[model samples]
Target: SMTDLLSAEDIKKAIGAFTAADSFDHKKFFQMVGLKKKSADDVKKVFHILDKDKSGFIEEDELGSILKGFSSDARDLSAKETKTLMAAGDKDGSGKIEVEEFSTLVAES
Candidate 1:
């Protein structure tokens, strides 16, 4: 619904309350944006956003792109930091993050 779209002020508030970290909580973010429900599809939706090229896996640089826009100031993660973040969730050591793998990094509570 159109109501699902968060206002700039609401987005600003949510961004303020959100803790800046290597990993972010998608579920909580949606709840704050008035989406109190969650599902595997929602996880996939987030993955798709980060996967830019429509690739099945999220490449290191693609992941970095998503993180870069995470803040109001749009901070960029260093290449080394980007690798570290991918390493943390790229469980199979494939050098890319799968939706299932990335979903594990989101906060459940």
Candidate 2:
């Protein structure tokens, strides 16, 4: 069973909103969308899902594909767009995003 923290409809809306948004603000998005506050473990679960390869890092391709399909109409991002998105959370100039970096990017306010 899914967590009661967010309903299916809420999740759908969250994805759409996150996808359409030009900038990402995790705390704001959660509050605006009414997502129950997640614990550290909950956040880790999300990170694992995004890190499909279990490599402990979110790669450019992973984020690129995920972002491309963030909206209902799935699409692929241009190389430039992919790079730009990756750069946003890649603080150390690393091509890939480590879990700590990602946590920091989406850390609660």
Candidate 3:
């Protein structure tokens, strides 16, 4: 449908109309945005991809890189938002995100 594309100038309007409709499920957005309900290993795969050092964790510096990567393609994520994400991911105050910490991050966002 023409309304499915995010780039459509009226997509927000369309979403509002859809939401007002009787049977629109908001969870469908997860599919639209490719936010799959991944398993532990699947989440691990993402953490591994970002943890270039294979340090079983991601450092703040690595998080900066990941943030930039996401911002490059997703306009919704500005550089400032990425920095906020970096801060949130560094939950242990060690300036890095361990695997479980990173998983908590993935789950939250």
Candidate 4:
């Protein structure tokens, strides 16, 4: 875990780098977003920001271009990339990721 607050710029750079790569580093992203096991409260805030339109869940589109949620300069996620992420996060198999689901995403990782 890090000591300083995770800056938005750092997040932008991290996500931008991932978008530019052929392989997406899931663990790097987990650390980049500061999504640690003890950071549950902040994880909820992160999830809310990602859950556009207050839909209570991260919809397909939201999960698709999730990089945009971190930064506008970030490129959109590929369907395959998004599919893998959704498959991991959507534990309930409801097709969407809930806050609790996103919580464990941070916690477990």
Q: Give the Cα-based TM-score of candidate 2 against the true structure.
A: 0.65
Q: Candidate 1 on 1-109: residue-level lDDT in tens?
A: 1223335554555545544654444445545643344466765665666677888888877766653333336444557657767767778988898888867756332
Ten-residue segment with the worst summed lDDT in candidate 1? 1-10
* Weakest lDDT window of 10 consecutive positions for candidate 2: 67-76
Best by lDDT: 4
Candidate number achieving the greatest TM-score relative to the actual structure: 4
Clashes of each: 0, 0, 0, 0
- Looking at model 1, the pairs that clash are none
Candidate 3, 1-109: lDDT as tens digits: 2223222333343244333323333234323333345677766666676676788777656654552222233223335544566666677787778888867765664
The alpha-carbon lDDT assigned to residue 55 of candidate 4 equals 92
- Candidate 3 vs candidate 4, TM-score winner: 4
TM-score of 1: 0.61
Which residue pairs does candidate 2 place in steric collision? none
- Residue-wise lDDT of candidate 2 within 1-109, one digit each (tens)? 1234445565566556555434544455455444346666665665666675789898888776543222324444456656766777788987898877766756643
Compared with the true structure, all predictions reach lDDT values of 0.59, 0.59, 0.51, 0.74
Residue 1's lDDT in candidate 2: 18
The CA lDDT at 101 in model 1 is 83
Model 1 residue 47 distance off true place after TM-score fit, in angstroms: 0.7
Error of 4 at 93 (Å): 0.7
